[PDB]
Amino acid sequence: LTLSQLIEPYYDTLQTILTYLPYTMLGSDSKIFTFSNNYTRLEIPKDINNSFSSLLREVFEFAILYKQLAIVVDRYKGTLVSAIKTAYIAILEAQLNKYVNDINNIFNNKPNSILVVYNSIFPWISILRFLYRVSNRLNRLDGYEFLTFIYSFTNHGDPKIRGIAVTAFTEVVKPYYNIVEHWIVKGELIDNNNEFFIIFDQEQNEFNSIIKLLPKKIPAFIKSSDKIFQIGKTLIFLNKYCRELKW
Amino acid sequence: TAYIAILEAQLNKYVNDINNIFNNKPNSILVVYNSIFPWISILRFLYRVSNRLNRLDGYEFLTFIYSFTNHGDPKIRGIAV
Amino acid sequence: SPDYVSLRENLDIMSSCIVDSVIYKSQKIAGPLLSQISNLNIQQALIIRELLFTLLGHEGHYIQYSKRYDPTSQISRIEGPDYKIAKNLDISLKVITKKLVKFGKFYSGLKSFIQVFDNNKFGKIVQKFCSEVRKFLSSYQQVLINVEHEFKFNKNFNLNMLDSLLHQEISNEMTHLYQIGIEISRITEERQKGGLLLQVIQERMVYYKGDPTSLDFLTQLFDIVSSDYIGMLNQWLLEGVINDPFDEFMIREKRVPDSFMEIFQSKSEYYWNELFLIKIDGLLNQFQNSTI
Amino acid sequence: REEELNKRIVNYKIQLKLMKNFLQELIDRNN
Amino acid sequence: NIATTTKSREEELNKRIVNYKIQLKLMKNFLQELIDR
């Protein structure tokens, strides 16, 4: 007889866990694990002795965090108006899709114990924690403060954290570069919200002062800003006052 | 330090040998003794050398070990070299 | 009483989100008394089952945290918990277990070290070291999984085999990482009453200068950890640009206050001769030369 | 005799260092 | 006695002191301009 058999009579606890664990990991209610309080806490049932409960408390960190991220993604999918936050939500959805596929792989290969499950998903601790922390501040932070907040993480020394930060920053910053592209090429302003370093003044009654620069909002990753402003102003002047549409 | 490193390697081999001797359920004390018998010279030599790791300096220790490489016994000279 | 796993309420980007300072008051399922069991095989299997969870830092039915371990204190978490073994275990099994328990202490200490020292205020060197610690933990769990598989299917498995395997496989690297981490904790708590990691590794490496495997591991760790510092130095000497805003780099360029901008623009000599400095604290012995 | 000149030289070295440290302190505090 | 040499020792020391009196006074003027604002 193996070691695990001789202990069976003297050790009582509810493979059955692995039967209902995949449904709990995907942020869904289970016969033995039930969420409560708007999916902010998970109740471990009776008949799970000290050790297994202590181990599960580490595994269930992924389930609750993923459920919170899924709630955020489903809630703010098409409600936010700012382009920066929308791009952030898009990359967040992509990351969650990858996580779900990873879980499906971990449980397609029938696992032997809870520990192999924990080890398989272990590399996702930093990604999930970072995404939860950033999404937690999607409300108070404005369109530009959010971009600056993410940008500060691209310098993180940790390859995993900096990898996810620089992965998300590309798509988060693309809309800003689209604003700059429209301003540079045609000479027009797109951002309806205050998330750019060039603005207008409808109340003004003279050309040279309708457009003004905001030196405080100039991002660090942009270059030759004082030339971008002049290019855009001269374009507006040419295509709306001189009416030289051909050139 | 290098001497301690090789000593640790030898002790690891000895522990693995003991594990083999008792994984094969022995019948009596004598089979146990015969199985580990070839380790008498290695253990005695290592204990004797390590006993003088304090008083001997860095170079005197090297010269002390070097004198055993000329030992005629294949087992003792094997471990010394 | 119901059991709940609830969400807890320079930001710590890797600090545990859920509550983990919960210590169970009494066992949820009452197991057999250890004194009641007299057979050696049963005791060995029971202690093995309890030990698999202990090695990850969790409590068991027969291995319990010492009353001195307070999760609130930072130093207590960093140094890891101390375990007490039930008095009714067999003497030989108790000794062997007391040797193996230390591995759970190191693992818990490292896991709590990551959740504290991996933020922006501790610099790129410490962050990159936390990366190594997290990769080592991932490797160590594959040593624990194999042990569990052998316990489950191998009939010849016994406590001595576990002791020999763990000691011969993962003890050395774990000891190195734990010692470096606890030394960092000691130094950083002393300084409150960054680049210092390289000094700790170099100081640590003097004792293992003759050991091949330990020296190889320490040299590899030093090489990967220092790579960020080499990046800063390379950019400084090739393009004259300082990049990382953590003030880690030795050549400290400082911003002129807005109140003095007009003054410093006129007298650019003082701008270019006073607002570039060399931070002597973070210098290695290679750069400890005036001309260099 | 020239000992006196050397002594004054070192005194002015210290005074210059103090002035530079004063500049650094002032700038650090204003920031 | 200290060796005599073709180069004027006292001249070198005096020039060093004068160059240390220019740096001090320029630094003082700059600090005065900095403090009064």
UniProtKB/TrEMBL annotation, chain B:
Cellular localization per UniProt: Cytoplasm, Cytoskeleton, Microtubule organizing center
Record-stated family: Belongs to the TUBGCP family.
Name of the featured protein: Spindle pole body component
Organism: Candida albicans (strain SC5314 / ATCC MYA-2876)
UniProtKB/TrEMBL annotation, chain C:
Domain of life, per lineage: Eukaryota
Gamma tubulin complex component protein N-terminal domain residues: 48-292
Subcellular location: Cytoplasm, Cytoskeleton, Microtubule organizing center
Family: Belongs to the TUBGCP family.
UniProt name for this protein: Spindle pole body component
Gene: SPC97
Range of the intact protein held here: 37 to 374 of 871
Automatic annotation (TrEMBL), chain E:
Listed transmembrane segments: none
Protein name: Mto2p-binding domain-containing protein
Organism per entry: Candida albicans (strain SC5314 / ATCC MYA-2876) (Yeast)
UniProt gene name: SPC72
Included range, full protein: 231 to 267 of 1006
